[PDB]
Design a protein around this nucleic acid. Structure first.
Lengths: 117, 119, 115, 117
DNA sequence: TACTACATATGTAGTA
DNA sequence: TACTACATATGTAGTA
DNA sequence: TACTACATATGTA
DNA sequence: ACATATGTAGTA
């Protein structure tokens, strides 16, 4: 089983957010929210290339990478893996822990209802 | 500067500690040796690391140490989850709950509780 | 058979034992979004299939279940698993753990549900 | 959104069971646990083909249909849907519903524990 | 208990 | 782009 | 409440 | 192609 590293996650989102994406195309978008070498980043791409979460496509004269797995399909999958290891009481016990630490503003708490519908 | 995290493997440990407030060497093992399958040594190590990371502490209560948490549960869990979501979900907490219902991971029995948890 | 959309109604009725035309609708027009007529239709169907019956309690019909709830859900899930999971019930629970859909808070209850 | 109908399922399981499968190779294995026409079946496959759940492969001189979706990954998902449409209280409320209707023998109740581990 | 050992996964980047 | 290199961190567990 | 219309998904062929 | 069951919903 191949898993996606937290450092890596950075990358996927950048790709997921742009469907298609290039070596540098990504770096530029990362070298702003993070601070790594353009070489360190590239390795994070190849790494995901090999784990096989994305693929290439010599679109221009350069590779263009794209996801292979479904974003939300995987994120749900990963949170579920996490929470399970952390919170003994599934998804709920967690939500109950956000409000306990009042991480919710009435403007936001409102949206949820209209999200549970 | 040096910052220390609590490993996902380690997390199992805290959960027992936290669950018993006071906790001995084996006391934990016995309690993990059902929800998991490690060696009573592997585990003890997890404790120790957690001790040197400084999330727990000891205290020879009887003739054997009793480790106890140093950090506050809810305090840390909420903190950890935030870190997670931010790395994973681009749209914060919301975007996540949205993701669970799109995957129908909730029963109206549960979805109900939430509201009465929102008020 | 009882259709998935129809299920919505039976839940309401079983929830209320006794149940009226609109009384159903109201309790449905929040957890769903259909036309009061669509709904009504679902009831008629069920009445016609013979899962529920009427009874002019006040001056309007009062439908109630004819089939025993837990007796049906059990029957229904049986047919289901059978069409989907090759290995009966087991092979299902097994599918739920492998996709970690269970929190230890939850897995716990099971044991004491198994004794 | 495209779904997999109860009838269809009989086809997939034949397929996932043999990973690789032939038009007739299927019918054979179904005309024992079921009673349909070698044309009724074929159509179920077709539908599934178009819905996009399986795909063909001219292996010999005949097509060989193979699964396109991951078994466990979808059965999990469908059950989910079902459970929540029916049982108010998710998975739990269901298992508790099998015991009440004593649909379990101590021989099998055992396995569970060792399966919950 | 305390202290020791190790192979893989991960963060982070220089050279062909 | 491709391929190489390394130190800390994490999973697992033997020896004093 | 009671009959009918309608596009879709669906059981059978 | 064809009949039925189904999500939705208006004219009886």
């Amino acid at each position: 089983t191949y898993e996606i590293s937290s450092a890596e996650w950075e990358v996927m989102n950048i790709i997921w957010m742009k469907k298609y994406a290039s070596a540098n195309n990504i770096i530029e978008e990362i070298q702003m929210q993070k601070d790594w070498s353009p070489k360190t980043i590239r390795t994070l791409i190849t790494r995901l290339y090999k784990k096989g979460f994305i693929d290439r496509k010599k679109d221009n004269k350069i590779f263009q990478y794209y996801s292979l797995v479904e974003e939300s399909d995987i994120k749900y999958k990963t949170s579920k893996n996490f929470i399970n290891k952390v919170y003994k009481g599934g998804f709920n016990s967690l939500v109950l822990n956000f409000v306990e630490k009042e991480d919710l503003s009435q403007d936001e708490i409102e949206e949820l209802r209209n999200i549970l519908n």
